Amino acid sequence: ATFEIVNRCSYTVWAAASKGDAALDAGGRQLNSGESWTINVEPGTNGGKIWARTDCYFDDSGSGICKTGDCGGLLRCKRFGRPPTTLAEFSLNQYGKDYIDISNIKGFNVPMDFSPTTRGCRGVRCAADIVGQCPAKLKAPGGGCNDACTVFQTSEYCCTTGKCGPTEYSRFFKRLCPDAFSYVLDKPTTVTCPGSSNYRVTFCPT
């Protein structure tokens, strides 16, 4: 499957693509404002994620640090990134279907649109000013708006027991971005697409 990753933000981002235990394609790349990066993702990929990282510094060897979304200091991510990270999430070719969603379960750093470029389903978007409106206790100094599980590490926010409800913090994310997951047991906003669809992830779609 082809994913085109487009940075429409006015600032540079470092895109990342991983399935948690391995890079997807090259795993990460710098995207200046306006740049597009096309990656290929193996069919049947389960649990892939794409996210943006902000305020990164890397040396010649691809080692460094980012203020949001850092994946163990690598330019080419092999593992998932440190919150806060708006997440594009996908599982491909699962019994004939693709499943896509956007998630704020790990916080929010950059607005995002996640849409198919082929026919048969709709896209999803979270483009509200979540960082600007972020509650004081969830604001991340490096930038972004943390989720409450990251900040407070309770069973209720992290849904550790498999039983949890919405919270004042999850309702904030849900109010601004209804089409994104706001906590682990949120009513699903997953979109079902035809198997082997292709996609575009746009940072700062507005």
DSSP string, 14-48: EEEEE-SSSEEEEEEEEE-TT-EEEEE--TT--SE
Domains and CATH numbers, the chain: 1-206 (2.60.110.10)
Q: Calculate the alpha carbon distances from 197 to 61, 79, 158 in Å.
A: 34, 24, 32
Q: How many CB atoms lie within 10 A of CB 26?
A: 14
β-sheet bridge partners, residue 63: 74
Resolution (A): 1.8
Which tokens is 187 given? 């009513």
Q: Where are the alpha helices (DSSP H) in the chain?
A: 130-133, 148-152, 155-158, 168-176
Question: Rounded CA gap, 46 and 161, in Å?
Answer: 24
Going by C-alpha positions, the residue among 141, 145, 157, 149 that lies closest to residue 107 is: 145
Smallest CA-to-CA distance from 9 within 100, 179, 143, 135 is with 143
CA dihedral 148, 150, 153, 158 (to 10 degrees): 70
CA atoms lying within 13 Å on the CB side of residue 114: 27
Helix (H, G, I), strand (E, B) or coil at 157: helix
The coordinates were experimentally obtained by X-ray
Q: Is 121 left (phi over 0), alpha (psi -120 to 50) or beta?
A: beta
> How is residue 69 written in tokens?
């979304």
Sequence-separated (6 or more) residues with CB below 8 Å from residue 117: 2, 4, 197, 198, 199, 200
CA 90 to chain centroid, in Å, comes to 10
User: Among 11, 6, 137, which residue's Cα sits nearest to residue 67?
Assistant: 11
